[PDB]
Ligand binder design. Structure first.
Ligand code: 67V
Ligand code: 67V
Ligand code: CL
Lengths: 337, 336
């Protein structure tokens, strides 16, 4: 019952971004469970307190809403839950087992965060209006808040999956990008054929510059790449099918996977009639949008990547996921506090 | 000795952005309009020049350009009380605009010289980069706005084609002109050049030729710069290879937007270096170089509510899209 002092103390501590290589040494063996416990009990309240302090600095008109009070109550409970293990001994295996259950329960509280935050934005539009300045402030915090949420849940999933009894938790060091593209297409195809009476076909063209025709693989979180590519397929298929409804030919959703010296780019092109440039900004705005696209961009940025969209009204749209090719360059992108 | 006084009066007035329709819409009318509007657009940018820090404002290039803008401002003020109905008054006005245009011809290399002076004198810091980028975007855009007025007046009033504006601007014709020019330059230096492929996508009127109302001279400069960088990257990347992949272009006509995508296969670029292609400072150094006329090219696009964007995939190639307003109703001057 001392959360305000806990937030002030740990807000001074800066978050600690981690590279892809560091995640592997932690998950290299089950013997590293103690080192992960001693690190996570310190780092988790730092990331919580930093965003929690940013949450409290919000204006009271936003902070006083029931949606914001609920999420802040979850962060406080999980913060106080993690701080019970600060005084415990890592050499006791029971202390380690209790921490995992705590982390699994911490996630269960924050499962419905994105739908909850979407309610507060809709409440804001109908109570205070949807003006450009309100969008910039809502975009600024939610990107940082969700980027903090992506970073925090990343740390939890690695410990629960590794320390349970080829894939290092949620990270696949031999991640076949084309297979993840095909999997995201297959899920979108299933939804497309149920909603519509057709589905665009898939085309993939890999471009390995240094090793032409060799399969392109990287070190990444495939669950993140699936989330980004899947949200892109749903948009490409919706526009492609609805644009060619009076037409018989259904163009394919062509994809390209280029492996450069630094970038691993993943372009997805449709022919859904495209979008005017005026409305491209609207697709990434939380208030004006239906958050799979901005959240997908955060997954890209989370490891120094990016996700960009460029369209041609009357023809179609192209979307490129930019990922760091090297695991060295793949480092956590956290909100600057 | 009232140059600061003249700047204060007309700087108070905000510039009036004009539409493409207004440009189509007589020398007395343009004479009376420009003698008010020109000193207003000069005063606003000359105001921001003095807002610069002492590091930049004290440079010889800045003070040199100020001498042209000050001298150009004073040239317009003689005609404030003159007679529009006098043909000698109107002719002197038209003659006065040509010298001001020719006076400011060496502004871009002069301003480019000042950036190099700052890079070597104070270093390449992020804060000065954004300020130089923020300032040069507004200064060069003001230069385009002023030249557009001067060219429209001097060319219309000489004593189907409205000066610099082509109401039936076939976009693919301007693309071929810029390509053929860049190809000859590519052939002269590299003794080789990629081939061009053009496609058109008229959504509202299939198979109708894509025409618009635009300034083809501004459109030629943008496409010319893009080909020069696409040809170099395609050539230099395939110097050991035999086949040069072609430079493909598409022209889409939507309900409101007219887009122009250009695509090469010059091995693409990392995402980190895309910023420096549009930066004045990082493109500035002691066919064309990668990112030379590209900052100013993006300004020509935004001058009528357009934009210019680059998207590259390292190991493959690069895409470049020019977004333009299809309708002259939405084509309006973006003024600082
Ligand atoms: C007004 O938004 C739209 O109607 C709209 C939106 C998208 C679209 N096509 C249309 C007509 N393709 C998209 C894509 C594909 C992979 C390249 C991604 C995200 C949104 C869209
Ligand atoms: C260091 O920048 C470069 O070397 C560089 C620059 C460009 C490029 N390819 C490379 C390797 N294509 C370009 C294009 C074409 C139409 C798509 C336009 C402008 C610059 C580039
Ligand atoms: Cl000038």
């Amino acid at each position: 019952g001392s959360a305000p002092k806990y937030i002030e103390h740990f807000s001074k501590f800066s978050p600690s971004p981690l590279s892809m290589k560091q995640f592997l040494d932690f998950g290299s063996s089950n013997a590293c469970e103690k080192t992960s416990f001693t690190f996570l009990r310190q780092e988790l309240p730092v990331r919580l307190a930093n965003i929690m302090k940013e949450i409290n600095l919000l204006p009271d008109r936003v902070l006083s809403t029931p949606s914001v009070q609920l999420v802040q109550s979850w962060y406080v409970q999980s913060l106080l839950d993690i701080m019970e293990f600060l005084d415990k001994d890592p050499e006791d295996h029971r202390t380690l087992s209790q921490f995992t259950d705590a982390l699994v329960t911490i996630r269960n509280r924050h499962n419905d965060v994105v739908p909850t935050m979407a309610q507060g934005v809709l409440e804001y539009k109908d109570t205070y209006g949807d003006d450009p300045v309100s969008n910039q402030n809502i975009q600024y915090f939610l990107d940082r808040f969700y980027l903090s949420r992506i970073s925090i849940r990343m740390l939890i999933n690695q410990h629960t999956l590794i320390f349970d009894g080829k894939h290092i938790g949620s990270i696949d060091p031999n991640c076949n990008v084309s297979e993840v593209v095909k999997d995201a297409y297959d899920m979108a195809k299933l939804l497309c054929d149920k909603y519509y009476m057709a589905s665009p076909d898939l085309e993939i063209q890999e471009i390995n510059a240094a090793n032409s025709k060799q399969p392109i693989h990287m070190v990444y979180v495939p669950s993140h790449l699936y989330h980004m590519l899947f949200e892109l397929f749903k948009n490409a298929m919706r526009a492609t099918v609805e644009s060619h409804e009076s037409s018989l030919i259904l163009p394919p959703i062509k994809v390209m996977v280029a492996l450069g010296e630094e970038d691993l780019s993943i372009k997805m092109s449709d022919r859904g009639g495209g979008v005017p440039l005026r409305k491209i900004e609207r697709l990434f705005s939380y208030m004006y949008s239906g958050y799979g696209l901005p959240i997908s961009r955060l997954y890209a940025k989370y490891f120094q990547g990016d996700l960009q969209l460029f369209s041609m009204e009357g023809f179609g749209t192209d979307a490129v996921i930019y990922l760091k090719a090297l695991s060295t360059d793949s480092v956590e992108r956290l909100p600057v506090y």
